[PDB]
Amino acid sequence: MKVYQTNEIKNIALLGSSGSGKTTLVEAMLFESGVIKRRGSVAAKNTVSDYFPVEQEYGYSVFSTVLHVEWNNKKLNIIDCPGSDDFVGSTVTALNVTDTAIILLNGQYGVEVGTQNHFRYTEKLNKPVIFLVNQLDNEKCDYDNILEQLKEAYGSKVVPIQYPIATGPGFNALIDVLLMKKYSWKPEGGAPVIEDIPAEEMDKAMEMHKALVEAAAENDEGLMEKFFEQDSLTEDEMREGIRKGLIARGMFPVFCVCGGKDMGVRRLMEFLGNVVPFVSEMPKVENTDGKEVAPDVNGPESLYFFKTSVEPHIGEVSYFKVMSGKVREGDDLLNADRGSKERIAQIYVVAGGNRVKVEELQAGDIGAAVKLKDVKTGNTLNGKDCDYKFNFIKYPNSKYSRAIKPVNEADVEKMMTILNRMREEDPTWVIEQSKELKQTLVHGQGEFHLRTLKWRLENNEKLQVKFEEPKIPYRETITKAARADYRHKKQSGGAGQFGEVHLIVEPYKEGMPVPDTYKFNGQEFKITVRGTEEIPLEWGGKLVFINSIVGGSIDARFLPAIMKGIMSRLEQGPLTGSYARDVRVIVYDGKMHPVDSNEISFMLAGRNAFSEAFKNAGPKILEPIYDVEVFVPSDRMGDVMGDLQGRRAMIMGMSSEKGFEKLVAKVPLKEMSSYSTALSSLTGGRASFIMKFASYELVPTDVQDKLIKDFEAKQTEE
Numbered sequence: 001m002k003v004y005q006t007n008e009i010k011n012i013a014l015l016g017s018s019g020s021g022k023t024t025l026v027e028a029m030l031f032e033s034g035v036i037k038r039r040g041s042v043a044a045k046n047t048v049s050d051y052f053p054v055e056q057e058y059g060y061s062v063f064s065t066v067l068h069v070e071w072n073n074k075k076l077n078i079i080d081c082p083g084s085d086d087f088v089g090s091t092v093t094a095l096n097v098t099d100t101a102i103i104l105l106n107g108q109y110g111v112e113v114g115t116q117n118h119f120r121y122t123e124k125l126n127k128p129v130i131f132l133v134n135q136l137d138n139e140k141c142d143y144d145n146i147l148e149q150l151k152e153a154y155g156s157k158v159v160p161i162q163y164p165i166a167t168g169p170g171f172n173a174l175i176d177v178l179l180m181k182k183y184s185w186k187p188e189g190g191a192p193v194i195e196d197i198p199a200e201e202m203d204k205a206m207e208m209h210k211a212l213v214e215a216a217a218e219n220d221e222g223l224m225e226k227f228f229e230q231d232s233l234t235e236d237e238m239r240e241g242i243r244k245g246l247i248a249r250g251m252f253p254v255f256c257v258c259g260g261k262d263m264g265v266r267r268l269m270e271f272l273g274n275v276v277p278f279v280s281e282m283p284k285v286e287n288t289d290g291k292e293v294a295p296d297v298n299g300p301e302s303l304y305f306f307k308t309s310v311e312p313h314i315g316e317v318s319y320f321k322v323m324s325g326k327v328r329e330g331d332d333l334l335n336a337d338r339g340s341k342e343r344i345a346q347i348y349v350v351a352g353g354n355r356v357k358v359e360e361l362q363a364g365d366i367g368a369a370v371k372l373k374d375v376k377t378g379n380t381l382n383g384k385d386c387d388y389k390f391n392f393i394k395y396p397n398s399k400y401s402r403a404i405k406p407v408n409e410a411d412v413e414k415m416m417t418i419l420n421r422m423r424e425e426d427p428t429w430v431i432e433q434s435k436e437l438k439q440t441l442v443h444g445q446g447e448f449h450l451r452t453l454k455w456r457l458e459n460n461e462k463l464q465v466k467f468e469e470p471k472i473p474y475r476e477t478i479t480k481a482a483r484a485d486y487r488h489k490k491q492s493g494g495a496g497q498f499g500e501v502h503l504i505v506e507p508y509k510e511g512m513p514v515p516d517t518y519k520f521n522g523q524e525f526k527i528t529v530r531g532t533e534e535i536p537l538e539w540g541g542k543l544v545f546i547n548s549i550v551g552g553s554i555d556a557r558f559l560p561a562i563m564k565g566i567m568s569r570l571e572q573g574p575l576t577g578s579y580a581r582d583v584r585v586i587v588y589d590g591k592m593h594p595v596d597s598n599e600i601s602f603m604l605a606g607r608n609a610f611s612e613a614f615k616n617a618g619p620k621i622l623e624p625i626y627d628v629e630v631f632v633p634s635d636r637m638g639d640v641m642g643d644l645q646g647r648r649a650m651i652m653g654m655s656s657e658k659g660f661e662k663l664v665a666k667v668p669l670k671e672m673s674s675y676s677t678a679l680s681s682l683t684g685g686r687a688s689f690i691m692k693f694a695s696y697e698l699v700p701t702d703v704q705d706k707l708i709k710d711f712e713a714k715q716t717e718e
């Protein structure tokens with residue numbers, strides 16, 4: 001409730017591999033700061049962070065939780081990312097908002113594949129990294145090995161700050177380097193018995209202290225001058241280097257903490273409030289107009305909303321971060337996107353699932369608000385003097401897609417509303433409503449990511465849903481030139497409705513002009529350029545209606561009747577009932593009755609004539625393909641290439657980058673239906689791929705035959 005200044009706040013986001021001790025460490029930090037009363041164990045299913053229903057039934061974190069700990073004149077805006085693999089949507093969301101990332105390492109395991117994955121996100125976003133070793137009570141541990149495992153993984157910038165005397169359940173003291181003191185503890189935990197380093201470990205402290213002061217010296221030019229003068233920095237002069245070094249991204253500290261037994265948590269909270277990048281020194285964020293927005297406390301107020309947790313039995317809560325300015329209760333704010341004139345009734349400060357009414361949130365601090373009208377994720381709310389509108393968080397591309405569908409076709413509207421709300425909760429649940437496919441597409445990050453969406457629908461809102469294979473957008477085309485003739489006449493009403501049009505059909509490709517000669521069955525037809533028209537279609541492709549009526553043999557105003565007739569049959573498609581594309585149509589000769597021919601006469605004449613041109617020509621089916629850039633380790637490069645060779649892929653590139661590689665391919669979309677599941681199995685969760693549409697190409701005939709037989713099988717049900 002106590003209003004915190006700009007210099008007294010600081011943003012941290014917890015990262016690390018799954019099952020490393022992030023949620024449990026959060027519980028200890030809140031307990032030692034007095035936010036909660038008694039610790040709740042993850043087995044007891046009463047933790048502060050994992051307060052969601054789905055997040056409890058699994059037993060591990062699903063949604064990152066925003067929460068704070070009050071310490072000595074410093075407030076920490078900790079965000080506890082889930083740390084899994086299929087929930088990286090919330091990891092990038094929290095890592096853009098925050099200003100420093102702490103990576104947790106499991107002592108028993110060491111540097112897992114989850115640790116490697118998250119550290120790549122920090123490199124992408126240029127965020128500080130502090131390595132934090134946890135779970136030191138497991139006997140299957142060796143702190144020397146953990147640094148040894150990590151020393152080659154990342155550069156020599158890594159320097160330790162603490163080391164335990166000995167691991168195992170008997171661990172109750174760890175020798176520090178930053179404060180040159182040994183911190184003993186009791187089995188209950190929470191009571192740091194500060195005590196000067198013993199004689200045996202006195203030898204081990206100096207060289208790392210010499211190493212530690214050396215690491216912080218090079219970070220700042222001024223501190224290097226102090227190194228020459230005094231040859232040693234004791235407490236605070238070397239603390240400034242870590243501030244700049246983390247900004248410089250050239251110093252990764254290593255810690256020790258037992259989150260299970262609350263050993264070092266008080267020391268951990270003291271460190272972060274002591275030396276991390278400030279909200280001011282962190283590289284300023286810029287809005288969509290290029291203005292380098294700075295964390296100015298006195299500037300205009302601007303709310304950025306990034307999380308919209310709608311956890312049941314509490315209500316819709318929309319978290320926000322203030323990029324600049326300050327927020328008083330009962331202020332006036334304008335929605336940058338679709339301005340609804342929102343008035344924040346009362347702001348809140350959030351500590352997991354528990355909120356406390358507060359009267360002010362200075363710039364660069366995370367907050368919360370409840371019961372808003374028209375605020376969605378990504379909407380920026382700001383004052384009337386400035387029209388700031390932020391868009392700087394780019395989520396990773398989709399990696400797995402299924403078409404959701406209710407068990408009964410009566411709750412479709414309800415399922416639309418729920419999915420929209422959950423897309424608001426997690427923006428990575430990309431939903432596209434394709435009219436051509438006539439299906440509700442759900443996009444995520446893997447097979448497991450969409451299963452979590454299913455579970456929330458099944459339990460929280462009591463709606464049954466199922467995931468089905470998504471339809472494929474197929475396009476028709478033709479191979480070789482051909483033609484046909486057709487004539488029409490009907491004398492059941494008034495006029496004869498006479499219509500006869502001879503037209504030539506051939507594929508259209510850019511760069512090749514139309515010839516004036518066509519060899520059809522040992523006969524010659526003359527084509528002249530009377531009209532060059534290329535109408536785009538709403539479903540992609542092109543249509544060319546080159547006309548060659550000889551000087552006015554047929555009426556020169558009756559062409560539009562054929563125009564709508566062709567597209568009527570072009571939309572359907574004879575081979576598979578799908579849209580066609582890239583066809584150049586040549587119309588030259590026809591027979592026209594002087595008075596009995598109207599628009600409907602030629603519309604039917606053109607339509608039926610065009611329909612029969614395909615089966616005399618060569619029809620084909622086009623399969624969309626996606627450019628794929630698989631980031632794969634060198635160890636499993638061979639197995640990944642083989643699988644692509646089973647996907648009818650095309651090897652195009654081979655990039656040797658660090659320990660990993662980078663593979664380029666053009667894999668058909670149908671073969672990419674379930675690749676994220678398959679790629680993880682082959683590699684072991686150490687690879688990622690990116691899809692990118694690259695137009696339609698043809699298919700081998702065996703694929704073509706499979707489609708046509710299935711197409712008629714559905715029609716037989718009538």
Ligand SMILES: Nc1nc2c(ncn2[C@@H]2O[C@H](COP(=O)(O)OP(=O)(O)OP(=O)(O)O)[C@@H](O)[C@H]2O)c(=O)[nH]1
Binds near residue numbers: 020
């Ligand atoms: N041996 C040992 N185990 C611990 C310690 N602290 C926590 N654990 C266990 O480690 C497990 C890891 O659980 P979490 O910390 O909740 O997992 P997380 O950090 O939220 O990451 P996710 O599993 O992806 O959600 C928990 O079930 C704890 O029981 C510890 O100090 N020593």
Ligand SMILES: [Mg+2]
Binds near residue numbers: 061081082
């Ligand atoms: Mg977790």
